[PDB]
Design a protein around this ligand. Structure first.
Ligand SMILES: CCNC(=O)[C@H]1O[C@@H](n2cnc3c(N)ncnc32)[C@H](O)[C@@H]1O
Length: 226
């Protein structure tokens, strides 16, 4: 049908508090941008813990994807950086709610008072996802939860939209965070750069983290980072 598209029912606005949170995060972390990756990996780890917990009581939990991993790949020619986990994933409703709406009050005070380090505060609380906007002009979240069809969440920070993924169920289960890198954040397309950061931020992750890398004549394959 053409109703959903004709009435733009796929477009949403961010909650005021979220807009404020995004600015705070982007303003206070301007000097420590690389931490966006640590945060995305941390979120992936959490999603992996959730499905792991679900599998405990639900025997069919891991059906869509038996592995529990975090895989990262740089697409230098597309100017894209991908962080994929085979965690619990998110349903269409969760994409809207979990990423578009938000201890909120105290955090706003704590962050402001911390600006006027905050790297640890972003981690303690769970709003590190937004640090991605420090290096990306657009952030895309493709997700597949056991109880819904694969969906795509996209945003340039001025609004966000969620749509059914026309590519179908390609993830099996999990989430891929896709960053359309800012022109100045081109270094995150470099394998070694990503490797140094990934290896430096996966040391405390109990799940295996891989980076799609090359070896030498030149062959590509997943390389374990932790
Ligand atoms: C304030 C930003 N919102 C989130 O990071 C929330 O969104 C969802 N989320 C973010 N990244 C992932 C992920 N990789 N897998 C599953 N849920 C996620 C979780 O519910 C998080 O608590």
């Amino acid at each position: 049908g053409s109703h959903m598209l004709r009435e733009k029912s796929e477009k949403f606005a961010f909650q005021a508090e979220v807009n404020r949170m995004m600015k705070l995060i982007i303003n206070s972390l301007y000097k420590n941008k690389e931490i966006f990756l640590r945060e995305l990996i941390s979120n992936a780890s959490d999603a992996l813990d959730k499905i792991r917990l679900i599998s405990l009581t639900d025997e069919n939990a891991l059906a869509g994807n038996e592995e529990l991993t975090v895989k990262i790949k740089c697409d230098k020619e597309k100017n894209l950086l991908h962080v994929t986990d085979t965690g619990v994933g998110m349903t269409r409703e969760e994409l809207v709610k979990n990423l578009g709406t938000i201890g909120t009050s105290e955090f706003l005070n704590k962050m402001t008072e911390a600006q006027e380090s905050t790297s640890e505060l972003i981690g303690q609380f769970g709003v590190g996802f937004y640090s991605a906007f420090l290096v990306a002009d657009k952030v895309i979240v493709t997700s597949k939860h056991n109880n819904d069809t694969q969906h795509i969440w996209e945003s340039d920070s001025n609004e966000f939209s969620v749509i059914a993924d026309p590519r179908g169920n390609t993830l099996g289960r999990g989430t891929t965070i896709t960053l359309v890198l800012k022109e100045e954040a081109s270094d995150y397309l470099e394998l070694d750069t990503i490797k140094n950061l990934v290896k430096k931020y996966s040391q405390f992750i109990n799940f295996p983290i891989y980076v799609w890398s090359s070896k030498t004549k030149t062959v590509w394959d997943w390389e374990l980072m932790n």
